[PDB]
Amino acid sequence: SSVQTAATSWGTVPSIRVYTANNGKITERCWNGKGWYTGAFNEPGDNVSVTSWLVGSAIHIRVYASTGTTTTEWCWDGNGWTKGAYTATN
Amino acid sequence: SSVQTAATSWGTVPSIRVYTANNGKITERCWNGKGWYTGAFNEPGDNVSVTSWLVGSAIHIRVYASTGTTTTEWCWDGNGWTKGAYTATN
Amino acid sequence: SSVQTAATSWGTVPSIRVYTANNGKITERCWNGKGWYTGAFNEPGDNVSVTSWLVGSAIHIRVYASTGTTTTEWCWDGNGWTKGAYTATN
Ligand SMILES: OC[C@@]1(O)OC[C@@H](O)[C@@H](O)[C@@H]1O
Ligand SMILES: OC[C@@]1(O)OC[C@@H](O)[C@@H](O)[C@@H]1O
Ligand SMILES: OC[C@@]1(O)OC[C@@H](O)[C@@H](O)[C@@H]1O
């Protein structure tokens, strides 16, 4: 009956991204040290998890969105979100 | 029917913090390389997620606790837990 | 009615591990920069969370699997998964 969140962060400011799944809809709230705002991420899912890493000063993000037994990976690589190649025989 | 956990860690020992939401109550078990113990975190929530970063050797933690459509951020910055400024129009 | 995932990553390639709990069974899909494959992790749980850290170039992983009010820690330290010492009075 409650929403579910995943979070990642990078740097020392830091930057934060919080993802929230809500009735099959996943949104993103972001923080970069000046204020909270709403991010470009809007994707279907009943559950979400996230991890992130830095390549120099480039941020790369992977969000794992799941409806039922199917799980989809979304990749941020600085040029808008794109679908990843993840798979599973759940 | 089961409890839900989130975890973060830092350093090389390392330090670990595991957060558990249980019937709207969120507790914290901690590890610093000598034994598991119970942490100062005790907050209302049906769901939890966490991220953390280091500023030199200072640890900063952000825990995201959710009941229903409302989500609250708690900040550790070395001086006890305090409420953060996170928001969302869920 | 949906599966639940947790994710961690390390390095710059990077390496990714995605954990999925599905009807009390937790599996692992892995990525090391050449393709997605299925990992050695197969453990009972209705919920999962993960964190990881590096000691030089050695990866250490901690997965937190939960059925009901009981929560179990599994440790990867380069020599196969082993049970950890975590505890809680949930
Ligand atoms: O497209 C980006 C990608 O190749 O990055 C590495 C892994 O996250 C893959 O699942 C993903 O498809
Ligand atoms: O008070 C600490 C704070 O400013 O830190 C950065 C963000 O986590 C904010 O949501 C939070 O309120
Ligand atoms: O056996 C490995 C271990 O000691 O590593 C540190 C902590 O994760 C403990 O819970 C765990 O048992």
Numbering used by the authors:
A (entry chain A), B (entry chain A), C (entry chain A): 1 to 90
What does the original paper state about this entry?
The β-propeller RSL crystallizes readily with sclx8, yielding at least four cocrystal forms depending on the precipitant and the pH. All three of the pH < pI crystal forms are mediated by the calixarene, devoid of protein–protein interfaces, and highly porous with a >50% solvent content. We show that mutating an aspartic acid to an asparagine results in two new cubic assemblies that depend also on the crystallization method.
Crystallization of RSL-D32N using the original conditions yielded a new crystal form (space group I213) with a C2 symmetric protein–calixarene–protein interface involving Asn32 and Lys34. The RSL-D32N mutant yields an altered assembly, in space group I213, with a single calixarene at a special position (crystallographic 2-fold axis), mediating a C2-symmetric junction at Val13 and Lys34. The calixarene has a distorted conformation, similar to that in the RSL–sclx8P3 crystal form, and masks about 440 Å2 of the protein surface. Surprisingly, the Lys25/Lys83 patch of RSL is devoid of calixarene (confirmed by S-SAD) and adjacent proteins in the crystal packing are separated by the van der Waals distance (∼4.5 Å). Despite repeated attempts to improve resolution, testing both large and small crystals as well as cross-linking or dehydration, the maximum resolution obtained from this crystal form was 2.6 Å. In contrast, the I213 assembly with a single calixarene has a decreased unit cell dimension of 95 Å and an ∼1.3-fold volume decrease.
